[PDB]
Symmetry: D3
Subunit: 136 residues, 6 copies
């Protein structure tokens, strides 16, 4: 296929208790029977699959200091700066599912573009850290 | 110096009308006298200085989609993923000044670490885009 | 095509002695008549093609401090961190050809994910280098 | 300070039972008293500290696919390609402590430089994936 | 489609004065009726579209310290180092349109490869900045 | 030290015939006695030192497609986008020594910032490649 690993289908996963447990938890957690490809590739290693899902579930689900949409927008900006194409798609879809409006999307993009610009400029100028930033 | 350009000080900026216009605008906009070093470096090219500041005002300052703190936390996240040291400092400072609490900072860091990991894993596996995402 | 440069075929390469010399050496070295696309794009500039191949041959082939499989796993991790999609494919194939097991692959992935995480966290925290790391 | 978070010292960690549990576990695991600064930064968020340490133990410590040194050299390579200065230092130190010799270090650097170059060249040419790799 | 945003067509754009103004300026500036996809995705947010185009027009068009071809080659090298696949294509096409020869292209590639190599080596070695570089 | 390898000084290089050959060649090539620290780090692996220098001479030095300054400015741009601090310094210095003026430096920075922004925006939107670019 196009991944460097096999993408496991539901039929195979039902024969793999460790993997089925994780996939059913994803579905129960997300409120949808759709589980996206990232998980189907991680499924080749049950231990990694569970470590990754447990993190995602802890960080991105439940009460916390930031609302779920805000968390997805941060995830989307990070995915972009890391130039992960799949991640740009999945987290844009997830942001939309968590209520991201066109207006909000446009602003997220604007920030990602501006930040990339100023980051590059700072790096080219080798701006030293202001001493005011270093006070305890 | 330590930068690859000179960092213009206030004394020099006094006699540079196009540049003082921006520094005045920055100070008038942030309510403070302190202008950080990025701007002092950009000041070598008054046009680029103006363009950069205009973008920052439009995107970052005022009524808009997202609150100022949310914008700043997205800005911090980008700065980290792009590996810019100065920028991590500057935008951690900005987010705090815009009211980022310890609790919020901890969750931003957790999201940044987690996204770094999944991004890396997806890239290694070369996961193709779900047809669902394309409809 | 899809590359920003032409991909040279065997028929054309046989008319180009400088390029044919390199391609035949790749085949002799690798023990296979298959030469992958990277080389076919580099072939547009014979000098660059030979500089690149000579490096690859020196670093990745022959006795050295690390075994060939270990070298490919490092190459694969680097390719990933540099987000080169083609390189993720080619070096996963090369790692497999050099004996990488499913278990080993899963561990390489695990390290790449964990390292990306801790690298990001360190960068966000701007952790200063421990003085113990700086002793001569 | 120089970090964007405080680096908890042993005195503070003494009275932080969830955090001392991890520092004790780290020390008990590495056989040494020295815990590097990354952990002291992570200690501000005891949960993230625990999660990060659990991953490191599972992936990096003990019987597994690859020897500990090989794991460390892959970790070093990633850290370099991601451009993390602290991490280059920390994992060069770890690899040496796990027995990386001058000769091995030189070859890792050579591979890292070479991969950087070919990755860059492939990206510029936008080489499509061979159909062979997809069967 | 394949973008995470809609790509606006000419028919729709003619109903959107703000967006049509920008697109016609691109065409007038570039001397061609072809406007590439980046602009059609930015078109979902007129304000961002105009901010981006105004920058591009100011920096990349008109008299300045560097000739237009040189500007495109720098843009292409940056795009590559940022691993933006679309940008590698568009700026290679733009460089060619501004007169880039095969010989020049090969040299740009050579520099991009070499720089990526030395940058990686310096980073792995953590080479400290020579004091000679720090004199005012 | 501050580097993860030792930086060989001229005294050590005196008695290292393969390495002095390169340092002599570098100095003979640049017309100057000053050899920057990158080479002193590479000198730990004489073979890698030689390979790296051979590439630099072939690509960067002499008659070729592009003038030496243009090559250096492309090299600077790459170094910035790859986020290498030392390299930003070294290649800003090289470009100046090869005649980069304030005006040229300002435009390089402007291009680097602009490309960073559009690259980021294209990646976020996942713009597909125009069929025009593929004919
Ligand atoms: Na002054
Ligand atoms: Na204390
Ligand atoms: Na000495």
């Amino acid at each position: 296929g196009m991944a460097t690993v096999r993408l496991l289908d539901d039929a195979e996963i039902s024969t793999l208790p460790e993997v089925k447990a994780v996939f059913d938890d994803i579905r129960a957690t997300r409120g949808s029977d759709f589980v996206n490809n990232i998980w189907r590739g991680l499924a080749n290693d049950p231990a990694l699959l569970k470590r990754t899902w447990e993190q995602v579930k802890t960080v991105m689900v439940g009460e916390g200091a930031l609302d779920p949409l805000t968390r997805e927008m941060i995830y989307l900006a990070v995915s972009t700066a890391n130039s992960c194409s799949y991640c740009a798609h999945s987290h844009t879809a997830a942001a939309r599912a968590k209520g991201m409006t066109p207006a909000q999307h446009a602003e997220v993009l604007a920030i990602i573009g501006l930040a990339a610009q100023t980051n590059a400029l700072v790096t080219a100028m080798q701006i030293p850290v202001d001493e005011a930033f270093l006070v305890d």
